[PDB]
Design a protein around this ligand. Structure first.
Ligand SMILES: COc1ncnc(NS(=O)(=O)c2ccc(NCC3=Nc4c(nc(N)[nH]c4=O)NC3)cc2)c1OC
Ligand SMILES: COc1ncnc(NS(=O)(=O)c2ccc(NCC3=Nc4c(nc(N)[nH]c4=O)NC3)cc2)c1OC
Ligand SMILES: Nc1ncnc2c1ncn2[C@@H]1O[C@H](COP(=O)(O)O)[C@@H](O)[C@H]1O
Ligand SMILES: Nc1ncnc2c1ncn2[C@@H]1O[C@H](COP(=O)(O)O)[C@@H](O)[C@H]1O
Ligand SMILES: [Ca+2]
Ligand SMILES: [Ca+2]
Ligand SMILES: [Mg+2]
Ligand SMILES: [Mg+2]
Lengths: 565, 550
């Protein structure tokens, strides 16, 4: 019924979308622009999967955008009933579109694939990300209209499909839309010309669940991040069970490991990172230590920015700056130093020789006010929050802006520098800490921090005995699935693992450090937060070389050649 | 009668088993046997490794001073071939046995009877073993005579249980003799054919202890420990009475133990190498070798040595070579080692600190230097960067009436000026390995215990930087062998990185520590380094991470 598609009785529905692009260079910019528009025109993003590389400007737009009929709020949430109900297949309001039969849907899907399987033989990088939206849109077909519009607004390849919509089984085998009925639907949610034309024909049909849902690997891979337990009448088994079957079966039958050519992405600034493919160095700039070790009482902002440069040319991708330490204010330590850096940089950016050399800037803070000022003056790109956004969750709201997002590091601790040493009792150390972080992430994701921008840090030496810091290292494979940031540098636990008497122990500690760096390298930790950037980079370089083999067959081939001589 | 005291000068090949189970004196006992073997039976021309195997103190020093002279001569000349040993390896043509031979059938019957009877004996009867094998070119006439002499040695070594020497093979003979009762006269009479005998108390305790002779020895096919050792020495050997080659037999014994009992027998039967006089379990530790270049006043040098022990180095490797014509290698190194020997000795009232004595390794290719060192008990290991290629005479100095000495064999080409040009290899990784193997075979032919030989790929000697890295990447190739390496402060390290240039010294030290990491996980046996504290700190931490607490 066309009349209740336009009726302004606003509804709350659960949609799950696929979002893809081809443009490797700017997948992060493309998909994050989609993402922000999805958050604008459809509802609130309440889940996301990792970004994946898979195998089968707009800065002008972001100012000239029309408003929406519905108000957004950055406000934090704890749960979601709508969502809770989506996952178990509890009762929801009836489909205001025609539901095709259960057993009818099966054969219907086939013909759209097998026919497309022929259009194929007329005849290469995909970048996938799935989302969940709490939608004020009232029906899939309406949303598709808006999705098509969003698609169109971004053109001068950005496919945004729709994978599910409540528990509905829908096929509309052949529809065309009124060149005008679109205007009505669009004006329903948006405040409005030259675009609608190219739209009208681009909505040839509609399948919920989307056709390729369980045939495309890239979609299972993504859906498994977000909603593993979810079942649907439409499919035999739960999304995790199907995903697993696709893996095992791809191995038994075709002798391929599918995970190799389909990679997980985490994002530090604006660029793609292949989970587990590198160990990045993070250089510690502690303004307290740098300033008050002379025994001196003054900040030396010029000194600090120099140390910042030292660090960059010593091979650190990320610099992590901190005002807290373990009568002058945190902010007054950090912001001026971040300020002098930003300037000093742009006064050598003229030489575009250092333009793709610019280091990522991470602020170690639990303070909202400090973070706000930093973001507001484009001074940082990552929040490093040792309280896991526990000291003040509101800080999460500062991790998303008009278009752009910021990546966060979440660390586990108990208590504080003075109290933590005795807060050492765990039921199950490794798993408690893992579960802790998995949960902070869930919370960030529920609030539409994109899953692929959150990094775990086990917090070595925070509320952990030296034996515990070791145990956490021994079991680091538990973070095999996740971006992992760690910080062993200079901590006392290193020394404890060892059989003028006070200067030896700093060498022993820095050198013992370099061991954990090696271990980190082989365990494929994602970032390590270090003081001794040159020493670390050296170690890492030698280890990388030893690993870069020219021919991966050569040792057997060569072995045989010897045996025949 | 006496076709057994025949005047005809016999050269035969006998393969021997040497077993003990005093872990703390394992080396001394076994080598003491090895010596009396060389003294009294003939010439050692192969040995296996040493193994801690799963079943089935100082009067030795007094013994060795007062041995009877052998009536057979000792010839330390280098040989590079042995016809009789080739004759034995192939299964070809030797003289008839003067002892009555049995056919295959009768041996297998009589073999089996001894096993089953000895099984039920063990079964109703209610502790590792240290194991080794040797091939002896022997002047003893026949296995029985030999068993007599080898019993004398078992007896000699007992205090007026400690060792068991058994004949595994003896030429290609099959021999089963059931009821050996040997006249008290006949024993004195055999022994005296091979030994200038001075007594006769022990001759008594010998009369009983020889009851029967089996050749091959009975448990040859039956004990892992035996097959394991033989696998080192004589893979291809196939005795008439054996189902297959030693190697085949070994593999089968291994693979059958993986299924029929699901065991994986390797795990509890460990290969052993020796640096000074203790046991080392191959691949169980990464020792640090401290570099001392006397390139340095004697007192400043010995200072450096004590600092290095405290920074936690197990071996020091002292070197005169790098040259300069002013002072001779001898005059650089010998003083230093003499000062060290003395100054350590002044602390010879602290009978606890004197376990932490470092093994001393002289980096030298010159006979004269090593001779002076060895003569004055100044060193334990010879680090010959030429693989004893330069002057093989040196090999003669790696053994004495009593001591044996371990040797690192490095691969290099040419000399320091030439070497940067001698850089073409057909199959780098295997060329070098094969080179080292041949070298080993040469010392082993020449009586050097195979467990005293350490292999070293010689990084940065006649290798381009990429080649030094290629070798490290393929270090797994030396999984079976004692492995010594030196990467320390070499140029290839710096080459990997992407460019006060005391800075470049650092990147090199620090990249050094990456290689220590890789060495540790690739279980390299020894690493020779300048930076002992830094190397120890890496290894200590990595070791902690690995040690899983309960
Ligand atoms: C005797 O008294 C003491 N003296 C010195 N150090 C002590 N503690 S410690 O060495 O174990 C140690 C050192 C530093 C820290 N914190 C440094 C940071 N660590 C991290 C970070 N961010 C992220 N994401 N992860 C991090 O691990 N920011 C700062 C924690 C423990 C100490 O005991 C309390
Ligand atoms: C003559 O020209 C040169 N001068 C300085 N550096 C050079 N390059 S280098 O740094 O790579 C280098 C440095 C030292 C060495 N040799 C040191 C040793 N190395 C070992 C040892 N013993 C054992 N067993 N194993 C060892 O690896 N003794 C001494 C080899 C290559 C160089 O050649 C291009
Ligand atoms: N679940 C869905 N989400 C988006 N488009 C759909 C869906 N089911 C069917 N379609 C139709 O299939 C086409 C999508 O193909 P594409 O060009 O890859 O976006 C559009 O014409 C849609 O009308
Ligand atoms: N090939 C052999 N090597 C050593 N002993 C042997 C051999 N063949 C038979 N025997 C006898 O087996 C017993 C070994 O005793 P034991 O050396 O105490 O284990 C002695 O009675 C020897 O006479
Ligand atoms: Ca919204
Ligand atoms: Ca001899
Ligand atoms: Mg589509
Ligand atoms: Mg015996």
């Amino acid at each position: 019924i066309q009349e209740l598609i336009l009726s302004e009785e606003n509804k709350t529905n659960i949609a799950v979308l696929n979002l893809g692009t081809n443009d490797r260079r700017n997948a992060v910019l493309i998909l994050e622009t989609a993402l922000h528009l999805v958050e604008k025109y459809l509802g609130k993003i309440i889940n996301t999967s990792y970004l994946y590389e898979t195998v089968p400007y707009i800065n002008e737009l972001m100012q000239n955008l029309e408003e929406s009929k519905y108000e957004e709020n950055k406000e934090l949430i704890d749960k979601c009933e709508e969502y809770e109900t989506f996952l178990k297949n509890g009762k929801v309001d009836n489909s205001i579109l025609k539901e095709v039969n259960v057993e009818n849907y099966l054969l219907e899907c086939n013909n759209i694939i097998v026919k497309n399987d022929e259009i194929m033989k007329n005849n290469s990088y995909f970048y996938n990300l799935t989302v969940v939206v709490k939608t004020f849109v009232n029906d899939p077909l309406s949303m598709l209209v808006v999705i098509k519009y969003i698609e169109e607004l971004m053109k001068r390849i950005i496919d945004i499909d729709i994978l599910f919509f409540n528990d509905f089984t829908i096929f509309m085998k052949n529809i065309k839309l009124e060149k005008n009925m679109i205007y009505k639907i669009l004006s329903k949610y948006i405040h409005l010309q030259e675009i609608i034309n190219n739209m009208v024909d681009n909505i040839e049909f509609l399948s919920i669940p989307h056709v390729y849902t369980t045939h495309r690997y890239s979609i299972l891979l993504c859906l498994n991040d977000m909603i593993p337990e979810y079942k649907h009448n439409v499919l035999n088994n739960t999304i995790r069970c199907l995903y697993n079957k696709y893996v095992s079966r791809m191995k038994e039958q075709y002798n391929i490991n599918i995970k190799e050519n389909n990679k997980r992405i985490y994002v530090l600034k604006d660029r793609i990172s292949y989970l587990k493919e590198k160990t990045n160095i993070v250089g510690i700039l502690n303004v307290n230590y740098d300033s008050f070790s002379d025994g001196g009482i003054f900040v030396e902002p010029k000194r600090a920015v120099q140390r910042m440069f030292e660090m960059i040319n010593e091979g650190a991708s990320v610099i992590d700056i901190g005002g807290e330490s373990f009568k002058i204010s945190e902010r007054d330590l950090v912001v001026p130093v971040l300020q002098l850096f930003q300037k000093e940089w742009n006064d050598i950016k003229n030489k575009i020789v250092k333009c793709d050399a610019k280091p990522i800037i991470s602020i170690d803070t639990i303070n909202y006010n400090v973070f706000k000022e930093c973001v507001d003056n484009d001074l940082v790109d990552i929040l490093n929050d040792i309280s896991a956004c526990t000291n003040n969750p509101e800080i999460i709201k500062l991790l998303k802006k008009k278009n752009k997002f910021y990546s966060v590091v979440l660390m586990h601790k108990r208590g504080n520098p003075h109290t933590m040493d005795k807060l050492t009792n765990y039921d199950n150390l490794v798993y408690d800490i893992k579960n802790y972080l998995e949960q902070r992430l869930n919370f960030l994701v529920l609030n539409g921090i994109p899953r692929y921008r959150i990094l775990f840090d086990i917090g070595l030496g925070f509320a952990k005995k030296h034996d515990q810091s070791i145990k956490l290292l021994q079991n680091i494979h538990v973070y095999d699935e996740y971006p992992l940031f760690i910080g062993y540098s200079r901590k006392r636990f290193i020394s404890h693992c060892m059989n003028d008497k006070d200067q030896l122990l700093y060498q022993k500690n820095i050198c013992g450090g370099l061991a954990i760096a090696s271990y980190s390298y082989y365990k494929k930790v994602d970032l390590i937060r270090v003081h001794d950037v040159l020493e670390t980079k050296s170690v890492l370089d030698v280890l990388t070389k030893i690993d870069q083999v020219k021919d991966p067959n050569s040792s057997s081939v060569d072995k045989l050649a010897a045996a025949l001589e």
